[PDB]
Amino acid sequence: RKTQPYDVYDQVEFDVPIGSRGDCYDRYLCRVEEMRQSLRIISQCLNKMPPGEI
Amino acid sequence: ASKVKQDMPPPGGYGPIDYKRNLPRRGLSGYSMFAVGIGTLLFGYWSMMKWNRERRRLQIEDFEARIALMP
């Protein structure tokens, strides 16, 4: 979504969680933080919905 | 003839949406917990000391009752 954006992903701001131990716990933390970042993106999308055809 | 109507955000925007981690501290110090534990232990020790001394006296009393009844 960052390096090769598609649709309007280059118009929303979010962070990318990064691990350091390469284990299950770090991936759990990354998934939880990705849920939080998805909430952030959802807020930005809700405030930026344009009119027009579908 | 009427205005175009569509599902749109309200004028202005939407209220801010919280997303960040919220884990409050909500705890006592270590010294306080340890002190409470030690005080509870000391209180229990003193109470049980008195109770067991009284129990020893009672045991001696009934042992003496036995000794009197033995002949």
Side-chain angles (χ1 to χ4, degrees), chain A, chain B residues 1-24 27-71:
Chain A
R1 283 172 301 161
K2 292 286 197 180
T3 67
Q4 299 167 19
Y6 51 96
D7 275 332
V8 291
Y9 268 119
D10 52 14
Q11 293 187 46
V12 288
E13 292 292 13
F14 61 102
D15 295 306
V16 170
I18 307 292
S20 301
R21 298 203 73 83
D23 58 349
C24 288
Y25 186 67
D26 275 19
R27 283 188 288 271
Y28 162 75
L29 295 177
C30 283
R31 283 191 178 88
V32 172
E33 194 48 45
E34 268 152 36
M35 275 186 261
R36 303 189 179 283
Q37 295 306 310
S38 290
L39 266 184
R40 189 173 158 193
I41 301 175
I42 281 174
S43 164
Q44 288 166 80
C45 278
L46 285 173
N47 280 308
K48 282 175 142 205
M49 178 70 41
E53 74 281 355
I54 54 156
Chain B
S2 310
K3 190 153 282 164
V4 167
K5 181 69 176 177
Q6 212 175 14
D7 202 29
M8 294 299 291
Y14 273 119
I17 291 170
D18 287 315
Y19 59 92
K20 272 172 195 173
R21 186 193 272 200
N22 208 278
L23 302 175
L28 279 149
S29 197
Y31 317 119
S32 296
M33 302 189 209
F34 283 128
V36 173
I38 304 294
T40 308
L41 282 185
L42 294 178
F43 174 77
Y45 293 168
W46 185 79
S47 190
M48 194 72 31
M49 175 210 297
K50 293 187 287 184
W51 181 223
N52 269 344
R53 282 173 188 176
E54 169 67 20
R55 285 167 82 203
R56 294 307 294 265
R57 278 187 294 275
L58 296 155
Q59 182 199 223
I60 289 173
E61 175 194 23
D62 56 78
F63 281 22
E64 279 167 1
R66 182 178 181 270
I67 277 176
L69 286 184
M70 275 176 93

